[PDB]
Design a protein around this ligand. Sequence first.
Ligand SMILES: C[C@H](Cc1ccc2c(c1)OCO2)[C@@H](C)Cc1ccc2c(c1)OCO2
Lengths: 331, 331, 331, 331
Amino acid sequence: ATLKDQLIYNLLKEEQTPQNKITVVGVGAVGMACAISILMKDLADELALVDVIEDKLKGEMMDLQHGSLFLRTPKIVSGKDYNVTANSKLVIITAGARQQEGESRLNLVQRNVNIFKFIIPNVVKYSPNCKLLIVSNPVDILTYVAWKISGFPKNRVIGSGCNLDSARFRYLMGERLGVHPLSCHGWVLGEHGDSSVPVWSGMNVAGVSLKTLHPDLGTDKDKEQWKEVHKQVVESAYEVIKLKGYTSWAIGLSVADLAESIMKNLRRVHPVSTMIKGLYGIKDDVFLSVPCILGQNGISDLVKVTLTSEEEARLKKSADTLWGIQKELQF
Amino acid sequence: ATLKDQLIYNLLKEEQTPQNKITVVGVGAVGMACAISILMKDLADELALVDVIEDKLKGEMMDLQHGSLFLRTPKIVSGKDYNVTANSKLVIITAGARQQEGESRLNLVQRNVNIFKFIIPNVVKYSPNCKLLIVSNPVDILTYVAWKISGFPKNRVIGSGCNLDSARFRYLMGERLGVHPLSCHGWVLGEHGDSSVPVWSGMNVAGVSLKTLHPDLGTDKDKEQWKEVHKQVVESAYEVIKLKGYTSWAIGLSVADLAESIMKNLRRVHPVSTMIKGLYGIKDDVFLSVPCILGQNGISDLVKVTLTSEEEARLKKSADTLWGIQKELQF
Amino acid sequence: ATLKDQLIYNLLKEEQTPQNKITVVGVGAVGMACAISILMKDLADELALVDVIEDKLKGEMMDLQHGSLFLRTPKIVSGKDYNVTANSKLVIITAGARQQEGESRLNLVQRNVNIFKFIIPNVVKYSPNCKLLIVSNPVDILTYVAWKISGFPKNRVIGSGCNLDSARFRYLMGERLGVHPLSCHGWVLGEHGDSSVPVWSGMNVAGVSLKTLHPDLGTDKDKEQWKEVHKQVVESAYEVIKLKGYTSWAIGLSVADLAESIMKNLRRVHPVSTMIKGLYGIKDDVFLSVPCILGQNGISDLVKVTLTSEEEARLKKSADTLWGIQKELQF
Amino acid sequence: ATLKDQLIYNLLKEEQTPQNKITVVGVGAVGMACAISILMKDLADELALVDVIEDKLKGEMMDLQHGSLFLRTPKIVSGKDYNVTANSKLVIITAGARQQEGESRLNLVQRNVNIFKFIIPNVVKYSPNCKLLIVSNPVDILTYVAWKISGFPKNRVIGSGCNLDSARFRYLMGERLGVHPLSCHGWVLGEHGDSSVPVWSGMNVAGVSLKTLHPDLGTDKDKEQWKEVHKQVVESAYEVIKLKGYTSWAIGLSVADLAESIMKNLRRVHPVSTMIKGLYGIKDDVFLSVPCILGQNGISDLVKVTLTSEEEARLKKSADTLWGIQKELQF
Ligand SMILES: C[C@H](Cc1ccc2c(c1)OCO2)[C@@H](C)Cc1ccc2c(c1)OCO2
């Protein structure tokens, strides 16, 4: 008899179906930063990685496995076949196309559509009850594409949206005020990028509205120039790409924060992109980031934030530009 | 409409089924210690508590709920009705009967058999697929009892066994050598109590056998009297009960550790009590403590420790004594 | 040639002094709840416990010690004698006298003063640079006493205040809303107890104020009853005491949350009692709960909440009550 | 008066010297893996990054700072100037020279001495009491270089050595036995690289020696060929480099596990590289991996493993080769 059998007596062997599996699609810097964050928060009893480049996929999987002694996620698997993703609670997408020189906004989205047209049906094939977390940019439009292709209900298709932008907001706010970002509250909503909206009314510390104590806040007369905080938020990623070539660590922690709320059914309020037909005068099928309650079933509730008219108009305007592209795609 | 409806648009309605639910039965000091450690290790999306004294149970649940801001377990429930325990992956049994002056050990067990005849079927009714972790004393016999009455397979009924005794042993080993318990290694096996067996052959640091270095180890010729380390293990709860009147914190911590291995499917080895007919000449249906691989199916494998003649004899003697009593029970 | 020395080669022997030491004064249910919560959050490399009953004290230290294997705090000590508290970064005081029948508020406070004339000087003797977290009740008066007897600067003397009161408020707020407490924001300030102040202006989810959305909120015209959420907060401990005899877990969790901000220099904002002479017209040396910024030097900063004139009145009445009793205390 | 002063009243302004600071030198993949794991395990209240490429340096620090909201390390600083390093408890060196096509061993080491002639004296300038953890390869020689240049006592210069080799060994062991690596015990010792020594005699589960059960274990007669497990350990990095370009995640988790033992003073045992002249019959100033007790003083103690005559001779010959390189280095 073999050493294993001499040492161990087996009671029963037939086993499986992981109870808390997460898949990351795409193992670029963003995907791997999500992977390492998820692993170190103990969110999953199985992590699956899939990407098109087979060697790097196997490489990144082997590197993670070599660190199992220091982890509590007993099964890490990889492959380009999406069969490795079967029975995932959460599937995080982070894959797609980078912008070519002088390319239209449209048609870039379309190349990305053509990618999701392979990724998304394979995901649904193997985890039909999963929740989908779209991180690939342009995240608002691509979350729509994944919803259209998957046929999932609107609550189980989530985009990372302004979740990291709001994190950055609060970091920069805490730097001005000398307070930890956990105690600086403030929301960046809407379309992810140049045209996000900073909701100055809700910017507080300990419930003290900063707009009340400083009514010029977020305007032009603002001698303290508080609108620069929101400018710094939308320039953040480019500032970091300029310096290290790409962002990864911050997006990876906010995705894990979002994974936490989903996998542990916390019902925490996050600014993520969800379908907001029926709200703020939006009548098209578009996703924008509003504060959502995330949990075991994705987005089960929305917070109806009171916007000004200038805020309300800026949202309807991004809604229109997104549908303008989205109506011009084809699937 | 309400303030809720005004602030919150709702997408879904409350289909749930918890996916990582734990129940502790018995809210004495042991149970509450298990509860608070499970809560602080983030092992469950729902904790249910059950006992017969309604007052204490509602207050303990309310006390925990007031801490929810600092926890990652968003639903804590309690009730004397076991319907609150529906859909538990793990049920931890701490309730029982305390031995009276001059009550024989048989009859003590039988009072517990009569209590378990109420708890175990109610647990099975609402969680037919759970793992059962029996913490109530005398643990080896009461694990037999919860097995018998539930009709679960052997892999899904576990007793605390010598888990905490082994932890205690490594603590004492650590203090003697000036190393942390995590890097001190030794196993206490068999019947939990005065007759447990210390496997002197397994005691080591960094794979350096202490018995080989110091052959006298564990005998009476031992100048360093290492046999009193096992004397301390089996007298610890007694000395701690002299001082504060009960033990709680170290049993809670050791139980939470087993729960982590089960809930996360780690396949770590722990000395817990499992039915060991077939090993070491034992031919009756007796539970003793032996190193068991723990995962999402409970005990999937066990380690066949090489024991000396003397060591094997004490296991045979405990199995006889245990069957001696189990033979006279009445289900 | 012992076993240890045959096994282990020593490089140097001297050179300890704990780097992140915490003391808990008092080992009643509250203090032990703090101890286990602090131990499970890994905030300390040394934990010291002191009380007058040597029995329970030694037995609580031994119970915590037995679980070392499951912990990351390598030294746990205890003693009647304060020299075991030497070199604490943080000393948490839970000890006190409890009101007997017939006894008046003053006299009970005087008894507490007399106990603090032994405890406080002995903390200072051995950890002169520590921060003092004062949990004993009435917490506002006794934070003053600790401040007066120690001569510590006011940043280094802190009362747990309405920390757990705000945490309760957010639990109940989250129940009414279907949202996790981490996402329901709201502050209870002032005197800890019946006279506490629920600052309705700051109540919000995602920065949407509930008062602005539903202006009857808090007042008596309020159809939805929100004023009762606060008096539920005020009767919480009473409802739990009536049921289980005392409260332990929730206060232990909130105190550990304060410790984490202090030990880790987070500069998170907490509603704790500090000396507020010079704000809101309060002119006497009196401690009430405001949002304080908390870190390695204690209360470094303090938020100035905008209060309505009735709210201002309440803090004035409370501060007047408190000086009424403190000017009668005998140090 | 600013918004900040309207919102916050300052009590105390000068505040500093950090109390749990860790520096990582080098912000390539290894160093950044260490940084994210350290941040992810709440080991430091300040983290400093140092490297010579200022752009990448600032970019990685900014990326991590943008996730502040998800972390518990309030201060992340960076600079090419080592003054940002001041008052570190622990300094992790990952920087070095990349090998060149057709460059000998003594040559590549010499260019690494040229680099350490700048790094080490600067570290020692600003943290003269720190612990030095060398991760740069060849780790055993470069740990010797760092010790010669620094003038530190041997307890405070630690090479990462075989720590990850043992972790990989225990993963491969667990993959064969169906047991988690935590419950699998191995020890790879000596010189990091092709010539390390797997101590077959220590390999066990639950104290059951594998070589005693299966005595051909590790040898050429082994019908199960367990020597192939060391072979996979020794060429695991070659395999990952060929697939993904470099190795990062697993070395980051293993360096963090070393950091947790030093910063929390655990006195866990780790196979790290230490100065061994005087032991295993070695006569020269060379560093070899050996099991060391790690705590706040660095290596306070080390374990004397009993080694066969073959194993001792493999260490002596590794030691002869290392001294042969080292005795020709130019400082
Ligand atoms: C006998 C143990 C056996 C054991 C089996 C199973 C277990 C267990 C311990 O703990 C948890 O599950 C020894 C040989 C080896 C060892 C290993 C790892 C170490 C160490 C020393 O120092 C620090 O990290």
